[PDB]
Amino acid sequence: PWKKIQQNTFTRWCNEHLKCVNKRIGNLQTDLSDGLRLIALLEVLSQKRMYRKYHQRPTFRQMQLENVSVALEFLDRESIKLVSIDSKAIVDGNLKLILGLVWTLILHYSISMPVWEDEGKQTPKQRLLGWIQNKIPYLPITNFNQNWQDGKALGALVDSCAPGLCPDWESWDPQKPVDNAREAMQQADDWLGVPQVITPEEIIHPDVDEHSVMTYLSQFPKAKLKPGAPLKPK
């Protein structure tokens, strides 16, 4: 069951981007095969259009391979190195490899490229880990799994971005993981506008993979306080 968390998160992350161009993925293992959603997703992330024309209604496997080819040449031109990916992998629904592709895109567009203020030559994992640490310097943040399990750090992070959103996170009962996670995230979703690409039940699970957590947490650096945010002190 928990072995679907990365798939779930990666799927939500894609939909969050695909909605603006009115598209959505139902099944990650099969909905990027005709290459149309993959192309759409790339156009949104890079804000650039494809180098050549593609088939807007690929019924045949050939047209799908050609379609993914457009998406893959696009990545090749942007100098975005992919891991063990060919068109055949996407079109045939090789789950493990398309997930690798999504993480590659997530890593590139969400952590490597973006401009981040709040001051936070280093691996992407280090950059995000550095930004987060700077936000809550009173918690030893060294990883993207165990540090978030009790759900208190999530409250600490949200309140750090907008002091007053979760002011008494420190007094939160550590043995109520989901309630802490939900509270923190729902507030981040509401007033910091970060989508819950990973759910509170998943973020605290013992098996949660660092990638899923990084995908969700990679959304805080560019987050901004909304107007009318209910803030309460001590």
Contacts (Cβ under 8 Å, ≥6 apart) of 218 = 106, 110, 111, 128
Same domain, 209 and 146: yes
Q: CA quadruple 138, 227, 213, 200: dihedral positive or negative?
A: positive
Residue 209 sits at φ, ψ, to 5 deg, of -85, 140
Which of 85, 115, 145 terminates a domain? The answer is 115
Cα separation values, 96 from 61, 75, 214, Å? 20, 19, 18
Contacts (Cβ under 8 Å, ≥6 apart) of 46 = 74, 78, 109
In Å, what resolution does this model reach? Answer: 2.4
Same domain, 88 and 121: no
> Could you identify the residue written with the tokens 């928990």?
2
Same domain, 104 and 122: no
Q: How far apart are CA 126 and CA 148, in angstroms?
A: 17
8 A C-beta contact, residue 105 and residue 17: no
Q: How far apart are CA 216 and CA 191, in angstroms?
A: 16
152: domain range? 116-234
Q: Is 112 in a helix, a strand, or coil?
A: helix
Give 221-224 contacts, CB < 8 A, sequence gap 24+.
Answer: 221/114, 221/116, 221/117, 221/118, 221/120, 221/128, 221/131, 222/114, 222/116, 223/161, 223/188, 223/192, 223/193, 223/194, 224/192, 224/193
Which of 82, 115, 148 terminates a domain? The answer is 115
Q: CA quadruple 185, 186, 188, 189: dihedral positive or negative?
A: positive
The number of distinct structural domains making up the chain is 2
Which of 57, 86, 115 terminates a domain? The answer is 115
What's the DSSP call for residue 225?
A: P
SS3 per-residue string spanning 158-214: HHHHCCCCCCCHHHCCCCCHHHHHHHHHHHHHHHCCCCCCCCHHHHCCCCCCHHHHH
Residue 176 sits at φ, ψ, to 5 deg, of -135, 60
Give the CATH number for residue 223: 1.10.418.10
> Which technique?
X-ray
8 A C-beta contact, residue 132 and residue 217: yes
Same domain, 154 and 165: yes
